[PDB]
Amino acid sequence: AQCSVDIQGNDQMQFNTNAITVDKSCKQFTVNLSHPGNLPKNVMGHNWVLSTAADMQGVVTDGMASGLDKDYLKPDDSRVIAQTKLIGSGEKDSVTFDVSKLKEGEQYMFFCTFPGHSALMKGHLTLK
Amino acid sequence: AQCSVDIQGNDQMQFNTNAITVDKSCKQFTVNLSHPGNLPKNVMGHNWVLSTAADMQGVVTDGMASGLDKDYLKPDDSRVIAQTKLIGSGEKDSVTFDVSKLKEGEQYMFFCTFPGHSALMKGHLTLK
Numbered sequence: 510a511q512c513s514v515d516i517q518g519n520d521q522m523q524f525n526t527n528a529i530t531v532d533k534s535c536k537q538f539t540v541n542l543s544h545p546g547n548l549p550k551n552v553m554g555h556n557w558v559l560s561t562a563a564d565m566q567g568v569v570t571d572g573m574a575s576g577l578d579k580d581y582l583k584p585d586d587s588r589v590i591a592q593t594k595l596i597g598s599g600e601k602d603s604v605t606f607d608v609s610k611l612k613e614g615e616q617y618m619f620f621c622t623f624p625g626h627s628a629l630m631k632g633h634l635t636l637k
Numbered sequence: 638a639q640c641s642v643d644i645q646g647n648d649q650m651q652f653n654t655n656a657i658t659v660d661k662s663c664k665q666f667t668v669n670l671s672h673p674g675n676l677p678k679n680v681m682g683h684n685w686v687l688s689t690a691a692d693m694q695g696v697v698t699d700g701m702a703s704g705l706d707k708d709y710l711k712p713d714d715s716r717v718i719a720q721t722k723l724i725g726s727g728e729k730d731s732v733t734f735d736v737s738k739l740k741e742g743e744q745y746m747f748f749c750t751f752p753g754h755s756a757l758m759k760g761h762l763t764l765k
């Protein structure tokens with residue numbers, strides 16, 4: 510099986526995919542995020558964050574108010590299933606999470622929580 | 638004479654200036670906003686909005702809740718000294734306001750109210 514995905518967030522404020530399917534046969538799933546652009550974190554930072562679709566907007570909004578030093582995420586936010594750190598040009602980061610934290614039937618979203626980025630940098634995740 | 642400024646908002650969520658000076662010998666001041674770049678206003682819209690620094694955060698927050706169809710600005714907002722409409726790539730808008738609206742002993746800020754954008758898209762405007 511394939512229990513991981515490789516994703517890029519670039520200088521044009523885009524992810525290079527908008528759809529991830531997590532095989533039910535996986536015990537854990539891994540996201541490897543990279544930044545092939547030239548701009549630094551404080552002006553084009555990207556992270557990869559996972560939540561219910563219903564929870565995305567709250568997570569995005571409290572993330573902005575938490576600020577850059579908190580990688581634009583509410584500390585210990587109950588809504589966040591999994592997250593990478595915030596990265597800039599030429600950096601990379603991975604995160605692994607337990608597939609047990611998901612629920613067949615629920616709708617999940619992945620997104621970047623850098624202010625304004627989720628209007629473009631978002632997509633759907635679902636178990637297969 | 639010079640009582641105007643040309644401002645851009647681009648696809649990287651930046652204004653091309655973060656400080657605007659008004660000459661006190663102007664009766665009126667005009668801002669010409671443009672959007673170079675190719676993303677449309679529903680994912681990268683920009684406006685130019687002016688308030689006291691103390692009121693910016695309330696204008697921005699009420700703006701997000703007003704939504705896209707109201708240019709992310711609360712209708713009849715007494716806190717707003719001047720505003721453009723929300724524009725996308727290839728579009729333009731201008732706004733003119735009375736310099737008499739800028740008072741003694743107040744500090745003013747300009748910003749975009751599209752969700753998240755004011756984190757980078759903000760600046761100071763001063764009368765001298």
Ligand SMILES: [Cu+2]
Nearest residue numbers: 554555621626
């Ligand atoms: Cu981002």
Ligand SMILES: [Cu+2]
Nearest residue numbers: 682683749754
């Ligand atoms: Cu904007």
